[PDB]
């Protein structure tokens, strides 16, 4: 019969700790911590990949089309964000190691680095970090540090469909964008154009003041932004610059879901969007906590490379965050009368 | 040169995941989570054992006598409590698994259980959980479930000196208890006896009242407690009953440190005492969070056994917690005379 | 315009700290911490009541009948559990206060206690802690400590519909229980009866294993069939060992088993959140007890230790549905025919 | 006798919630959360100020000279770190509010802002954030937004001695720096110079290239003028002597007299870290709520211009082999 230690293959897991300081005849106690910490990180990366790959497959193989599967999708994404939340907290363990003490074994580590985490890279890639959007380290590609089946895996990760791509595809199919249907984008442009007109009238009416002057300038700004939403070419341009990532139609789908999130069919889809943003947030918080530690340990340069990874260029779903820019009054939102509610009702 | 994956023997760590559901031709997704969670726990237990064993050795080998080593001792104990804090939070990850989903692979796990965690047992033992006071599960001894070098290791863990025993030894050597020296115990008994007398007079003077009675009743209770501290035989009795764990002299040492904690030589010792209590607390919080989950997963015998492990019967440093019972007014505390104070400097 | 400090009425919030040790001419530093900690707890209790009362209203006014409201309901319940998670962590702040230091101002507190938190009680009540099932303190009822409008509010809180009651009501209306419809309960009894038989046949196929298998089977059979004894339920209900109506229990199990069906996805989330709130409330109680121990020693401790029991778990029924888990293949197949109803 | 609600003045605390959305006849549910969150933050800031001011006083009144007070000092600093850790987690509560929902009451807030947290500013100042090194928002001074007793308090907070200043003073008095005593700085320069030479005596090019880099850094430690210059720029904060005291404590931390002082240094760095983490978590949220200047201004607060104890972090840069560290034989350890 099956025993715990065997079920968990602890013969492997708990015989994987080799202090290099010890191997070279100068055992340093805190090296053990350094080893375990990373090994735990790698376990959890493996788990995250497990969840993420599973969700990619649900999209890739069209199961997501069957909306019964949305609960599973959101659960696993949420689980990823829970794991990441932990991985952030896990830095607290390694903060128990002083720089002075780390200094006593750092030499036996050269020339190895976290940079060589295949899994971390797989994770970046599978979520949808693009190579053109990557900061080079020492003017080199991240993959040039990897060889063999490893380089092969990393390629597959780059070449196979990312979560971003798969979500984009799914977002494009969001119900309500059909011009022959609810014509969301049309109704939205109209309602915003109308609404803005109304507002300008209001402001013009205001008695010549400095508040008014301010309100006028504000209006100009908002009007610009709000209408920029309907400039597909602006989008295509911002896409090429990598300031956006999602297709124009995917963006429409996402905003559809934002605005109509209470409608039954969009309740769990809205949760998914939230979770995708959570993953981006937590990944960046991981990067920041990593930076903050490397600083404490090595001083001021990897530090600056790392500091550069704490940017929106590494946020895959930055588009979802930026939909907050285009928030309008609720009353401007195209009406979902019972008439046109049925298509979003399950 | 050295590569990350090799340094961390990831060839082992990341090839230790064997879904039994998959091995029996019915892969269940959430099983992977269950495996990784446990594997992470076991990594961290290993680290805790590493820290704990190191601190045990510092005591057993008299390095703790050189007070330079106190910083190291407290840091590592604190590190243990930081890890435990994390392990408690780690349950949040496994709470992402529904009971319904766990039910879909629980069959392939029989007859294995967490009970078979050698390391968890080693940890209990090395801290100082006593078998005499271990709740039996289904009329079984915990060790009877283990065989081979495992059973051997568990025995060694039981027989070799525990942290409690080693701390006890060290506490017995606490400066200030010397009757021919500061005579803390003597001065304390005197000051308490005197103080209590004084209070009684205060109350006796009061006029008969329900208040007076309420006060007299309280005084009797306090007097009882405070004086029970000087009944060595009561202690020896409670020791045999396992309601206390520390020698009478170790108890004196601990209270010495509590009362004079601001004195330089006692500052880090007091920190150590705090950390020992923290470890007990977090260990029991681990047990409670484990229970809370087994309930959500299996419903309500195991559950009840587990609920019973969340008791003071498992609290190794219960004596340190209970020194709060014997708090006296500050002014009752034997004054540290300038000459005397010298013995607590470095 | 509006100023931050005024918007937040900080003239009140940040002039509410009066050290009693200082008022009596012996200021103790750590008293300040003790005050702030509690004040923060109370702020968050107020917020929890705000969320909880809002959700109660959505149920009581029948808005929950319109399923567009489910996202809001689950978000606010989830928000409650997030606040509670914080309130648990908040104990870590007060653990920075030593018992020795607390001892230096404890006297100036008498005879006040956390016990007198009106809000904590309102929260217990509004979730659905029953007075009859409350552990007595000092051989007396919790409310005897309260007077005036406070006692009045506490009564209202006890008498007005609890979250449990309102969820019960809603669970009773769960689709699928209709005997004329999917007849879940019927199909379930049948499928379990059948499934158990099939297992016995497997088992009937002598060994140590066999001995074990049959013992397991016996209990499982007992448990699973006990589910269909409405009388046992009504009995356990009167004993307060269960809380939900038998019909509500059917609704809940319906949702468990068919949770992936779109209409049940967010409802299942709600059930999970209700259990989370119970769990976190218990974790708060445990962390409270653990601290009172470190501070006062060894007995309110014992009273408190008694509050960490199933007597205080309002949705214990939802936790215990794990007992009645069956193989997936036993679950009545959700008719593609009528699937559209769900 | 005393009642809980009265002891805690809950008549004030629990009657301080005024939804502006409600005051203007359009109550929005999530506004309540926004209010409470901030109120909780402010309570905890008050507590932090209480701890911090107490520690400042222990330094300023010379009690820290009596080393029995070090336990109290480190406990309270650690307590600050624990509160800050909580305040970081507290953002998770407000993350339960969607941008869509926040949008429904944001209007009733104009023109109010977190910027106007007197306490947050008092906290920045009392720790030792320098005004000249503060990034302007909208080409404006932070204090310009405050008037009355508030502006007065903020000034006092700027003018009275900061934690940094008080720690600096104390670090300068670290035992061991006496040239006539252990003569740490000399022993250090000597041992380093010697060891570096030996290394030179000993890919090879890259190693030599690295050695040159190393040597540069290590020797830069003894350039008092470089330091004084970097000090005036505000790229460093501590006096040259305080820096020596700190490094003394780093290297000899195991020595009993330095055990708790080393803990203090660690905690000062922890407070810097946690303050920055607060700033970052605030940013990461304003982004999800407002989208996009504020975000970027805030991203600028995650600069080391806001790290008061940056000197303590950077002592990791000047790390030598242990065997280079001047030996503390008990005779000269007697202290
Ligand atoms: C003492 C603690 C640590 C130090 C000093 C440290 C140092 C560094 C440095 C300097 C780099 C930049 C590449 C290089 O120059 O070698 C780096 C990158 C990295 N580290 Fe760490 N690290 C630490 C802990 C960790 C931990 C716990 C993880 C967990 C897996 C980790 C994972 C990584 C990863 C994945 C990268 C590449 C990041 C990217 O390219 O965006 N490191 N680390
Ligand atoms: C699905 C999650 C879990 C379930 C259902 C579960 C179930 C159980 C049960 C029923 C027991 C009591 C003994 C028995 O009946 O075999 C037990 C004990 C134990 N479990 Fe778990 N467990 C879970 C997760 C974990 C995790 C994450 C750990 C991490 C190491 C763990 C470690 C243990 C240990 C060490 C014991 C023995 C405790 C003692 O004897 O004091 N379990 N578990
Ligand atoms: C020094 C810290 C604390 C001590 C010593 C303490 C002590 C006690 C004691 C002894 C009781 C039992 C009733 C009594 O005998 O007076 C109690 C109950 C209670 N305490 Fe605390 N407490 C502490 C912190 C807190 C905090 C931070 C809260 C936050 C609100 C709190 C809330 C309560 C509540 C609500 C009760 C009633 C609980 C129930 O009946 O189930 N206490 N406390
Ligand atoms: C909906 C949530 C929040 C939003 C949208 C928000 C927005 C902003 C913005 C845009 C700024 C930049 C200054 C300005 O434009 O007025 C700011 C600054 C600030 N916020 Fe917030 N904030 C939020 C929550 C909080 C919370 C919970 C705190 C906690 C008290 C807080 C404290 C501050 C502080 C202290 C500043 C000034 C920071 C500095 O100057 O470094 N905010 N906030
Ligand atoms: C396993 C092994 C090593 C690491 C590191 C890591 C990375 C860089 C390190 C280091 C540890 N100790 N010193 N350095 C020097 C920094 N150099 C190295 C590369 N060239 C320029 C920067 C992090 N995680 C690990 C896991
Ligand atoms: C690895 C493997 C298994 C586990 C468990 C665990 C423990 C008990 C379990 C279980 C999983 N699934 N069903 N049970 C039945 C409980 N019974 C068994 C003994 N007789 C009464 C209770 C926890 N962690 C694990 C790690
Ligand atoms: C505000 C004020 C006080 C509290 C307490 C609290 C409650 C009871 C306490 C206490 C603190 N310190 N000692 N006790 C004594 C416990 N018993 C003794 C026997 N008679 C009844 C009281 C918790 N939160 C508070 C907030
Ligand atoms: C109480 C009241 C408001 C706040 C904010 C806060 C600050 C600025 C906000 C906001 C909320 N919502 N929108 N803005 C606009 C940002 N503008 C203002 C200045 N001009 C450029 C940026 C945070 N905490 C609060 C507490
Ligand atoms: C049938 C569909 N699930 C349509 C779809 C796409 N994105 C959505 C978001 C919310 C609701 C529905 C959708 C599909 O084609 O996947
Ligand atoms: C020399 C000594 N380390 C003395 C000692 C024992 N316990 C203590 C507690 C606090 C301070 C000192 C001690 C020893 O005998 O180990
Ligand atoms: C229309 C309805 N909301 C039906 C209902 C009740 N409970 C449920 C649980 C899950 C799904 C639907 C329901 C009502 O009658 O309120
Ligand atoms: C006597 C002294 N406490 C000297 C002092 C300053 N910093 C220190 C650090 C560690 C040890 C001692 C000191 C004082 O003058 O305050």
């Amino acid at each position: 019969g099956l025993i715990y230690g065997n079920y968990l293959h602890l013969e492997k897991v708990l015989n994987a700790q080799e202090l290099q300081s010890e191997t070279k005849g100068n055992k340093i106690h805190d090296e053990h911590l350094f080893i375990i910490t990373h090994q735990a990180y790698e376990l959890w990366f493996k788990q995250i990949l497990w969840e993420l790959d599973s969700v990619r497959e649900i999209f890739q193989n069209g199961h997501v089309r069957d909306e019964r599967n949305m609960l599973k999708v959101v659960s696993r994404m949420h689980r990823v964000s829970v794991i990441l939340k932990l991985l952030v907290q896990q830095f607290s363990i390694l903060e128990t190691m002083t720089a002075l003490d780390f200094n006593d074994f750092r030499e036996y580590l050269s020339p190895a680095s976290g940079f060589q985490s295949l899994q971390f890279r797989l994770l970046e890639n599978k979520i949808g970090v693009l190579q053109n959007m990557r900061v080079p380290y020492n003017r080199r590609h991240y993959r040039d540090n990897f060889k063999g089946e490893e380089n092969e895996l990393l390629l597959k990760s780059e070449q196979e469909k990312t979560l971003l791509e798969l979500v984009e595809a799914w977002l494009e199919r969001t119900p309500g964008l059909e011009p022959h249907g609810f014509n969301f984008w049309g109704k939205l442009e109209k309602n915003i154009t109308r609404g803005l007109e109304e507002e300008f009238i209001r402001i013009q009416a205001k008695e010549e003041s400095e508040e008014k002057e301010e309100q006028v300038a504000e209006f100009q700004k908002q009007k610009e932004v709000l209408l920029s939403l309907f400039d597909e070419k602006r989008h295509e341009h911002l896409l090429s610059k990598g300031e956006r990532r999602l297709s124009y139609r995917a963006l429409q789908g996402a905003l559809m879901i934002y605005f109509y999130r209470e409608e039954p069919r969009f309740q769990v889809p809205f949760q998914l969007l939230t979770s995708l943003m959570d993953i981006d947030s937590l990944m960046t918080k991981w990067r920041y906590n990593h930076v903050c530690m490397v600083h404490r340990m090595l001083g001021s340069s990897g530090y600056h490379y790392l500091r550069s990874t704490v940017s929106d260029r590494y946020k895959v779903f930055v588009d979802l965050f930026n939909l907050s820019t285009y928030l309008i009054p609720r009353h401007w939102i195209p009406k979902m009368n019972p008439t046109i509610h049925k298509f979003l009702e399950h």
Side-chain angles (χ1 to χ4, degrees), chain A:
Chain A
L2 190 58
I3 310 174
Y4 177 86
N6 301 345
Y7 172 65
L8 302 178
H9 289 274
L10 299 184
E11 68 274 358
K12 302 206 199 158
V13 180
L14 296 176
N15 292 303
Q17 297 70 42
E18 177 170 359
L19 278 62
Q20 278 307 304
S21 61
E22 186 175 8
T23 289
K24 309 293 198 157
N26 179 41
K27 190 175 80 169
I28 305 295
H29 173 84
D30 274 10
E31 182 173 6
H32 197 282
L33 176 58
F34 184 83
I35 289 173
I36 289 292
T37 308
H38 284 87
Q39 292 180 316
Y41 276 110
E42 290 287 343
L43 281 174
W44 283 123
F45 293 155
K46 183 156 179 194
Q47 185 63 41
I48 291 174
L49 287 170
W50 180 268
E51 298 300 340
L52 187 53
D53 274 339
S54 80
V55 169
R56 285 177 55 249
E57 176 167 4
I58 296 176
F59 278 88
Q60 266 190 294
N61 294 139
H63 290 89
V64 68
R65 294 172 173 286
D66 178 1
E67 292 181 51
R68 297 175 59 280
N69 294 118
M70 281 305 301
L71 187 49
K72 177 180 291 168
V73 161
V74 162
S75 294
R76 290 181 182 169
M77 290 320 294
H78 178 252
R79 173 181 288 179
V80 169
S81 62
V82 176
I83 295 172
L84 284 168
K85 222 135 71 198
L86 187 72
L87 298 196
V88 175
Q89 284 154 1
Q90 189 161 293
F91 281 107
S92 73
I93 284 175
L94 202 47
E95 286 164 357
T96 69
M97 180 171 70
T98 74
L100 299 138
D101 291 298
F102 171 68
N103 190 60
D104 298 351
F105 66 93
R106 54 194 295 280
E107 51 164 293
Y108 308 96
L109 306 177
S110 163
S113 180
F115 211 96
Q116 310 170 302
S117 175
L118 168 76
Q119 287 199 128
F120 186 79
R121 300 307 185 195
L122 293 171
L123 174 57
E124 287 180 310
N125 292 343
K126 285 161 177 298
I127 295 174
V129 172
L130 278 174
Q131 282 51 60
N132 46 67
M133 299 292 310
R134 285 201 175 245
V135 172
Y137 189 39
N138 291 356
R139 298 79 150 225
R140 204 149 78 246
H141 196 222
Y142 79 94
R143 255 170 49 242
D144 293 0
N145 305 52
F146 298 84
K147 278 148 286 191
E149 283 154 60
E150 289 199 6
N151 208 308
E152 294 214 42
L153 272 191
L154 281 173
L155 279 166
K156 282 155 52 49
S157 81
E158 287 179 330
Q159 288 260 79
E160 295 164 12
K161 303 250 220 175
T162 65
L163 181 66
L164 173 72
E165 283 182 288
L166 290 168
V167 162
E168 175 172 66
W170 169 78
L171 277 176
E172 281 172 353
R173 304 195 303 273
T174 299
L177 309 175
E178 299 89 8
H180 50 270
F182 180 83
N183 189 51
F184 166 62
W185 216 230
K187 287 182 180 148
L188 191 66
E189 189 169 3
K190 206 283 181 190
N191 293 7
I192 291 177
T193 306
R194 156 159 284 299
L196 282 172
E197 291 166 358
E198 296 177 0
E199 191 76 356
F200 184 78
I201 305 174
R202 181 182 71 60
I203 307 180
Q204 276 294 118
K206 298 298 206 63
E207 295 204 299
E208 307 310 294
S209 312
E210 187 58 7
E211 200 188 7
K212 172 177 186 165
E213 207 71 291
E214 299 155 0
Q215 291 174 106
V216 173
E218 181 106 353
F219 174 86
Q220 212 62 56
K221 214 163 178 198
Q222 200 56 236
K223 182 183 198 170
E224 194 139 295
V225 167
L226 284 179
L227 297 174
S228 74
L229 187 63
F230 304 99
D231 182 1
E232 183 159 355
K233 288 193 166 71
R234 190 178 200 249
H235 180 90
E236 279 163 2
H237 169 76
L238 288 172
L239 218 41
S240 320
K241 286 187 159 165
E243 295 178 28
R244 305 193 185 171
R245 301 205 222 303
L246 281 174
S247 74
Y248 191 63
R249 189 178 183 172
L251 199 83
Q252 298 176 17
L255 199 44
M256 177 87 198
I257 289 166
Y258 271 30
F259 283 159
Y260 299 113
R261 58 201 191 289
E262 298 220 78
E263 298 297 306
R265 273 186 74 203
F266 285 160
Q267 288 180 354
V268 172
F270 176 77
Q271 287 175 0
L272 177 59
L273 294 187
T274 301
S275 268
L276 292 173
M277 283 184 285
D278 292 353
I279 288 164
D280 261 343
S281 284
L282 280 166
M283 283 287 294
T284 59
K285 283 178 192 165
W286 184 95
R287 293 169 186 291
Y288 177 71
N289 276 237
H290 177 251
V291 164
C292 258
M293 194 172 43
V294 182
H295 186 216
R296 162 188 293 248
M297 294 285 184
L298 295 185
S300 300
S301 180
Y303 177 76
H304 294 91
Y305 159 76
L306 293 171
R307 275 219 75 68
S308 75
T309 68
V310 186
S311 166
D312 286 352
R313 60 195 306 182
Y314 277 96
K315 274 192 190 176
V316 171
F317 294 100
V318 68
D319 292 305
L320 302 181
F321 289 86
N322 280 316
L323 287 174
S324 301
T325 300
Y326 309 98
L327 301 183
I328 67 183
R330 313 255 288 188
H331 74 272
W332 295 21
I333 304 184
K335 315 275 72 183
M336 187 81 68
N337 299 124
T339 310
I340 206 83
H341 163 38
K342 201 181 174 185
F343 88 94
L344 285 182
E345 200 181 292
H346 71 205

